[PDB]
From Swiss-Prot:
Zn(2+) 1 binds at residues 50, 52, 110, 112. The chain holds residues 869 to 1008 of 2193 of the full protein. It comes from Coxsackievirus A16 (strain G-10). Coiled coil: none annotated. Homodimer. The active site is at 15 (for protease 2a activity), 33 (for protease 2a activity), 104 (for protease 2a activity). This is Protease 2A. Cysteine protease that cleaves viral polyprotein and specific host proteins. It is responsible for the autocatalytic cleavage between the P1 and P2 regions, which is the first cleavage occurring in the polyprotein. Also cleaves the host translation initiation factor EIF4G1, in order to shut down the capped cellular mRNA translation. Inhibits the host nucleus-cytoplasm protein and RNA trafficking by cleaving host members of the nuclear pores. Counteracts stress granule formation probably by antagonizing its assembly or promoting its dissassembly. It comes from the Viruses.
Amino acid sequence: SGAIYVGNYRVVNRHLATHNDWANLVWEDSSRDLLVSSTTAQGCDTIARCDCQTGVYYCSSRRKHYPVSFSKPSLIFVEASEYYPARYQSHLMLAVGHSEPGDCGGILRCQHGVVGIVSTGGNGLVGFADVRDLLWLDEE
Ligand SMILES: [Zn+2]
Protein backbone atom coordinates (compact mmCIF):
# COMPACT_ATOMS: atom_id res chain seq x y z
CA SER A 1 0.00 0.00 0.00
CA GLY A 2 0.96 3.68 -0.22
CA ALA A 3 0.21 7.03 -1.81
CA ILE A 4 1.74 10.35 -2.82
CA TYR A 5 0.13 13.46 -1.23
CA VAL A 6 1.02 16.52 -3.33
CA GLY A 7 -1.05 19.72 -3.05
CA ASN A 8 -4.72 18.74 -3.11
CA TYR A 9 -3.93 15.42 -4.91
CA ARG A 10 -3.65 11.79 -3.69
CA VAL A 11 -1.73 9.49 -6.15
CA VAL A 12 -2.30 5.74 -5.72
CA ASN A 13 -2.02 2.55 -7.74
CA ARG A 14 -5.27 2.35 -9.81
CA HIS A 15 -5.71 -1.28 -8.65
CA LEU A 16 -5.72 -0.14 -4.95
CA ALA A 17 -8.01 2.93 -5.40
CA THR A 18 -10.87 3.14 -2.85
CA HIS A 19 -14.54 4.13 -3.36
CA ASN A 20 -13.60 7.56 -1.91
CA ASP A 21 -10.83 7.90 -4.52
CA TRP A 22 -13.30 7.14 -7.33
CA ALA A 23 -15.91 9.48 -5.72
CA ASN A 24 -13.23 12.30 -5.85
CA LEU A 25 -11.58 11.29 -9.12
CA VAL A 26 -9.21 13.68 -10.93
CA TRP A 27 -7.47 11.38 -13.42
CA GLU A 28 -6.92 7.65 -13.97
CA ASP A 29 -5.06 5.48 -16.49
CA SER A 30 -5.24 1.65 -16.40
CA SER A 31 -2.22 1.36 -18.77
CA ARG A 32 -0.06 3.20 -16.11
CA ASP A 33 -1.77 1.66 -13.00
CA LEU A 34 -2.30 5.24 -11.65
CA LEU A 35 -5.29 7.04 -10.20
CA VAL A 36 -5.33 10.55 -8.71
CA SER A 37 -8.08 11.74 -6.37
CA SER A 38 -8.69 15.20 -4.81
CA THR A 39 -8.00 15.78 -1.06
CA THR A 40 -9.48 18.26 1.49
CA ALA A 41 -6.07 18.75 3.20
CA GLN A 42 -2.86 20.00 1.45
CA GLY A 43 -0.13 17.34 1.02
CA CYS A 44 3.60 18.14 1.30
CA ASP A 45 5.25 15.58 -0.99
CA THR A 46 7.37 17.15 -3.74
CA ILE A 47 7.30 15.44 -7.17
CA ALA A 48 10.74 15.07 -8.82
CA ARG A 49 11.10 16.98 -12.09
CA CYS A 50 14.16 15.29 -13.62
CA ASP A 51 15.48 12.31 -15.65
CA CYS A 52 17.26 10.66 -12.69
CA GLN A 53 17.92 6.92 -12.94
CA THR A 54 19.18 6.49 -9.39
CA GLY A 55 17.12 6.77 -6.21
CA VAL A 56 15.80 4.90 -3.17
CA TYR A 57 12.51 2.98 -2.84
CA TYR A 58 10.54 1.64 0.11
CA CYS A 59 9.93 -2.13 0.12
CA SER A 60 7.23 -2.89 2.75
CA SER A 61 7.83 -6.70 2.41
CA ARG A 62 11.42 -6.15 3.76
CA ARG A 63 10.81 -3.08 5.97
CA LYS A 64 13.73 -1.57 4.02
CA HIS A 65 14.58 1.38 1.78
CA TYR A 66 16.88 0.17 -1.04
CA PRO A 67 19.10 2.35 -3.25
CA VAL A 68 18.47 1.36 -6.90
CA SER A 69 19.29 2.19 -10.50
CA PHE A 70 16.09 2.32 -12.62
CA SER A 71 15.31 2.42 -16.32
CA LYS A 72 13.65 5.10 -18.47
CA PRO A 73 9.81 5.25 -18.31
CA SER A 74 8.65 2.93 -21.15
CA LEU A 75 5.98 0.50 -22.44
CA ILE A 76 6.91 -2.95 -21.03
CA PHE A 77 5.22 -6.38 -21.07
CA VAL A 78 4.42 -7.33 -17.44
CA GLU A 79 3.81 -11.02 -16.52
CA ALA A 80 0.55 -11.84 -14.74
CA SER A 81 0.38 -10.76 -11.05
CA GLU A 82 -2.33 -11.37 -8.42
CA TYR A 83 -3.97 -7.99 -9.47
CA TYR A 84 -3.42 -7.75 -13.32
CA PRO A 85 -3.20 -10.21 -16.21
CA ALA A 86 -0.07 -10.40 -18.36
CA ARG A 87 -0.18 -7.11 -20.29
CA TYR A 88 1.62 -3.98 -21.49
CA GLN A 89 2.06 -1.22 -18.86
CA SER A 90 3.14 2.28 -19.93
CA HIS A 91 5.40 4.87 -18.14
CA LEU A 92 6.99 1.93 -16.25
CA MET A 93 10.61 1.93 -14.94
CA LEU A 94 12.39 -1.28 -13.83
CA ALA A 95 15.10 -1.90 -11.23
CA VAL A 96 16.76 -5.04 -9.89
CA GLY A 97 15.14 -5.56 -6.55
CA HIS A 98 12.41 -7.15 -4.49
CA SER A 99 8.69 -6.42 -5.09
CA GLU A 100 5.61 -8.41 -3.94
CA PRO A 101 2.01 -7.27 -4.56
CA GLY A 102 1.78 -5.70 -1.04
CA ASP A 103 4.80 -3.50 -1.95
CA CYS A 104 2.67 -1.54 -4.47
CA GLY A 105 2.51 2.13 -3.40
CA GLY A 106 6.05 2.22 -1.97
CA ILE A 107 7.71 5.54 -2.88
CA LEU A 108 10.75 5.78 -5.17
CA ARG A 109 12.58 9.09 -4.42
CA CYS A 110 15.64 10.85 -5.86
CA GLN A 111 17.39 14.09 -4.83
CA HIS A 112 14.51 16.06 -6.55
CA GLY A 113 11.61 14.35 -4.71
CA VAL A 114 9.10 11.58 -5.49
CA VAL A 115 9.80 9.81 -8.84
CA GLY A 116 7.00 7.23 -8.67
CA ILE A 117 5.40 4.32 -6.79
CA VAL A 118 5.96 0.56 -6.89
CA SER A 119 3.54 -0.99 -9.40
CA THR A 120 5.04 -4.34 -10.59
CA GLY A 121 7.22 -7.18 -9.27
CA GLY A 122 8.52 -10.65 -10.14
CA ASN A 123 11.63 -12.34 -11.64
CA GLY A 124 13.81 -10.23 -9.23
CA LEU A 125 12.68 -6.92 -10.78
CA VAL A 126 10.67 -4.09 -9.28
CA GLY A 127 8.61 -1.82 -11.54
CA PHE A 128 7.72 1.81 -10.68
CA ALA A 129 4.91 3.88 -12.19
CA ASP A 130 6.56 7.19 -13.07
CA VAL A 131 4.79 10.46 -12.05
CA ARG A 132 7.49 12.96 -13.12
CA ASP A 133 5.71 13.71 -16.47
CA LEU A 134 2.43 14.69 -14.62
CA LEU A 135 3.38 18.38 -14.30
CA TRP A 136 -0.21 19.39 -13.34
CA LEU A 137 0.27 17.69 -9.91
CA ASP A 138 2.41 20.84 -9.07
CA GLU A 139 -0.55 23.29 -9.58
CA GLU A 140 -4.37 24.06 -9.29
ZN1 LIG B 1 15.80 13.35 -9.75
